[PDB]
């Protein structure tokens, strides 16, 4: 046997190459490690979390350092609308002179990459102005990463290793993370906005050298303690204010103007400061709900186990039995990870949906490539997080759920009508797919036969009504905020609608992304998105609920989360594990996010062209998507290098192919299966054994990749090709075509 | 009231589409019908809105017709399947259509909504949960 892997004697005794592969695939599955206890598991997880935080801080420090070292931040400040931000320098010693010339741009004298992450706008909005400030931030983040690494090492020492009870104390953790991690951090960010960001946006330098004796507001802190809070809202920035200058600058630190700053076309800094102040207050209040050490406070176990509603007998909250759940979540790390991943995915989707329509950073709405990249990035991350949430839900079903401690509660009821749940999800998926595809191909046939008027074009009247209710007067509806005489618009009892003017100005602006006009194509693509969401949910839920067993495999729970199959008997059982359901659902997640990002990108490309009619008339049939979106916009991307020369798009041109290569490779891992390769490897083993002068010899016997390993590798190649190809296409079609 | 949608006969783009059309069976009368009855968007193509109290029959008639036809097909199939259960070899009756049984099922399913309501009222529509095969939890 070998020393590696240290955590598994079964793998350490494996005499084949598989031992290496699985050693990488099971390294972070701490629960299956040899001689693993719960306390050691929690301590190792805690140290690993410290390490991950340190890695994140190092990543941020590296971004800041490379911008400060090789970027053009100071030049970009003077003209954010016409200067291309620089990510970092290029050193590829195998470039030719044409490539060096093509990549030397954005005012640099050396080849550089153009930043598309939006960090320039973010740092500009929060008051950073010089490369020295970015360098100081990078050094500080290096020190912070060192501190967190030291903390991770320290909390593994015997005297500082926390006990299992410390990890299991849910109520104090919730209190501290709601009041301190969320509330106090938000208050500190609001303090940074008020003391630094707003004065810098008003042309006043505030730093560590003078912030102690430079009050952010003339009224001082006396207005807050006296109760004269309105003094903080007096004299806001005028509509003629110029960012990073005192021209038209106000003095208020907490306004609620709403809408967008007229020049930067982004949210008001004072509005954001007041937002974070309110969020801090709300979260600090929320962080006092649970009982920790002083008697007062709710006990989550008591609330879950409660059976009396002010005297009346009830099965629980909403008359639903929630008893025994406190121990279920508290003892199942996979359950908590499922909620964590689902919440992070929903938050990432919300970030993507709210950042393009309500840009928070100055001039970031006019950087089209940055907007597209950010939206696609956060949406794909959200999809991955949702897939992970459901995968770990299935892992919880297999490993952590025990029926007797959950007898009668809502989880048991879900497990008991899983058949109805899955069948109804399948029905919804079938209905959506059938009718959406049928209407698409009907429109395709009608347009192909010169009868575009015969298309079925269902108006999205409900979403249009919602937009009108939000203040969009384009559609002619006269309800709620689009009706100036409505009870909602006037807010008759108090008339405290201090958001309505700016919000309506932003809503009815024709040059932003706030409630974009929608028609039949938007209707059809939204129903396609619904189909994708429902099918991905069907796959994930069917995998999670059938993880413990089914009619085909009644004893699945005894075989674990990830196993290849149960053999060809009983008809064949390929891809029967819940891991296989997650593997299948990754494909549908990729397809759904592809549809979503295609829709977003094509609509915004049409808007930025000045050719909205193209999207309006072509998105109702699939040939329109194929021709006017992909084929039409691929020209500049595929002309990045040609027999006549190269330009700055060459990298994207190459990467576009690279992704297409990786995608193709995945098919080989997904279509061909193991035994073919095992027999081929046996033949190659004979060949090597019988060849002279080949003194080498394997220490690990070469074998074909396992079935599950092959599925994972094929999925990885498929995903990498998908992401690389779409990212190259997105960047090339937006950047090579715009600023 | 929705203002972005106007009758097709008053849409200049729809008029241009009508004039530019081929003069065949497929375009003349369809365009006359679309101009008289349809609502057109800014692109000149007919659009189908679900926000009008009027022309509600235009929505309910096709929906009701399809629902009736689909329920007829489903009830015919269900009645035939339930009739073949009492046989000794139902699979042979599912690969060999029993014509008198199918005709009887179709004739009864002609009035499928009333029969479905009666079956739901009498509890004959659904089987109880404990007589249905299920997988272990």
């Amino acid at each position: 046997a070998t020393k590696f892997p240290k955590f598994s004697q079964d793998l350490a005794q494996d005499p084949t190459t598989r031992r290496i592969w699985y050693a990488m695939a099971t390294a972070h599955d701490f629960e299956l490690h040899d001689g693993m206890t719960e306390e050691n598991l929690y301590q190792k997880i805690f140290a690993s979390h410290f390490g991950h935080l340190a890695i994140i801080f190092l990543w941020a420090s590296g971004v800041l350092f490379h911008v400060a070292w090789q970027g053009n931040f100071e030049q970009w400040i003077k003209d954010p609308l016409n200067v291309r931000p620089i990510a970092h320098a290029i050193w590829d010693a195998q470039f030719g002179p044409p490539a060096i010339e093509a990549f030397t741009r954005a005012g640099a004298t050396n080849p550089v990459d153009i930043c598309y992450s939006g960090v320039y706008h973010w740092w500009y909005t929060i008051g950073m102005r010089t490369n020295n400030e970015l360098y100081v931030g990078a050094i500080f983040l290096l020190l912070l990463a060192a501190l967190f690494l030291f903390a991770g090492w320290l909390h593994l020492q015997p005297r500082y290793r926390p006990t299992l009870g410390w990890f299991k104390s849910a109520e104090p953790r919730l209190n501290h993370h709601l009041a301190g991690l969320f509330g106090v951090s938000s208050l500190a960010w609001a303090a940074h906005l008020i003391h630094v960001a707003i004065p810098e946006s008003r042309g006043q330098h505030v730093g560590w050298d003078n912030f102690l004796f430079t009050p952010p507001h003339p009224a001082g802190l006396g207005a807050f303690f006296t109760g004269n809070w309105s003094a903080y809202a007096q004299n806001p920035d005028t509509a003629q204010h110029v960012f990073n200058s005192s021209q038209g600058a106000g003095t208020a630190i907490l306004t609620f103007l709403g809408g967008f700053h007229p020049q930067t076309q982004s949210l008001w800094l004072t509005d954001m400061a007041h937002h974070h102040v309110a969020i801090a207050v709300l979260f600090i209040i929320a962080g006092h709900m649970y009982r920790t050490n002083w008697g007062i406070g709710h006990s989550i176990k008591e609330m879950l186990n409660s059976k009396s509603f002010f005297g009346a007998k009830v099965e629980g909250p909403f008359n639903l039995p929630h008893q025994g759940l406190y121990d279920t979540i508290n003892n199942s790390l996979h359950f908590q990870l499922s909620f964590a991943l689902a919440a992070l995915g929903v938050a990432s989707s919300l970030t993507a949906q709210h950042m393009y329509s309500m840009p928070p950073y100055a001039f970031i709405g006019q950087d089209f490539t940055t907007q597209a990249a950010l939206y696609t990035h956060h949406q794909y991350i959200a999809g991955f997080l949702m897939v992970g949430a459901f995968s770990h839900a299935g892992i919880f079903w297999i490993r952590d759920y025990d029926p007797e401690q959950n007898k009668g509660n809502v989880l048991d009821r879900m497990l008991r009508h899983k058949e109805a749940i899955i069948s109804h999800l399948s029905w919804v998926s079938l209905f959506l797919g059938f009718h959406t595809l049928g209407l698409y191909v009907h429109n395709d046939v009608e347009v192909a036969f010169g009868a575009a008027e015969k298309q079925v074009l269902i108006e999205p009247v409900f979403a249009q009504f919602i937009q009108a209710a939000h203040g969009k007067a384009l559609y002619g509806f006269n309800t709620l905020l689009s009706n100036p005489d409505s009870i909602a618009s006037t807010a008759w009892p108090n008339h405290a609608n201090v958001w309505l003017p700016g919000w309506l100005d932003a809503v009815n602006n024709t040059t932003n992304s706030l409630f974009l006009t929608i028609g039949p194509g938007d209707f059809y693509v939204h129903h396609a998105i619904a189909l994708g969401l429902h099918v991905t949910t069907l796959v994930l839920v069917k995998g999670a609920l059938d993880a413990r067993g089914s009619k085909l495999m009644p004893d699945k729970k005894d075989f674990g989360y990830a196993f290849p199959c149960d053999g060809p008997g009983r008809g064949g059982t390929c891809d029967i594990s819940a891991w296989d359901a997650s593997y299948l659902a990754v494909f549908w997640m990729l397809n759904t996010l592809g549809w979503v990002t295609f829709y977003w990108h094509w609509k915004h490309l049409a808007i930025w062209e000045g050719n909205i009619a193209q999207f309006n008339e072509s998105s109702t049939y699939l040939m329109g998507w194929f021709r006017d979106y992909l084929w039409l916009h691929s020209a500049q991307l595929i002309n990045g290098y040609n027999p006549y020369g190269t330009n700055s798009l060459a990298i994207w041109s190459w990467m576009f192919l690279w992704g297409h290569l990786a995608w193709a490779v995945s098919f080989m891992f997904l279509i061909t299966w193991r035994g073919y390769w095992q027999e081929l490897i046996e033949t190659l083993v004979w060949a090597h054994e019988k060849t002279p002068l080949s003194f080498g010899y394997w220490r690990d016997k070469p074998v074909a990749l396992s079935i599950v390993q092959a599925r994972l590798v094929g999925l990885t190649h498929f995903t990498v090709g998908y992401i690389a190809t779409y990212g190259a296409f997105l960047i090339a079609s937006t950047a090579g075509k715009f600023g | 009231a929705n203002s972005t949608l106007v009758p097709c006969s008053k849409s200049p783009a729809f008029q241009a589409r009508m004039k530019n059309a081929p003069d065949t069976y497929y375009f003349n009368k369809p365009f006359k019908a679309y101009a008289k009855y349809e609502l057109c968007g800014t692109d000149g193509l007919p659009h189908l809105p679900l926000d009008r109290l009027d022309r509600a029959t235009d929505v309910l008639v096709p929906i009701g017709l399809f629902l009736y036809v689909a329920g007829f097909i489903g009830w015919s199939g269900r009645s035939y399947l339930r009739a073949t259960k009492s046989a000794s070899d139902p699979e042979m009756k599912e690969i060999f259509i029993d014509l008198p049984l199918a005709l009887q099922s179709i004739s009864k399913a002609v009035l499928w909504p009333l029969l479905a309501l009666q079956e739901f009222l009498s509890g004959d529509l659904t089987a109880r949960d404990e007589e249905i095969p299920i997988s272990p939890r």
Binding site: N319, F462, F465, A469, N478, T479, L480, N483, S486, I487 | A1, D51, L53
Partner: peptide
Amino acid sequence: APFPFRTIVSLILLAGNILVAAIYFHIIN
């Protein structure tokens, strides 16, 4: 069984949907 709690919650949700539709159809303002 009449299912009191279920039907009450369902009727409340349906009444909310009907009120939203009534606002949406310009029946009320």
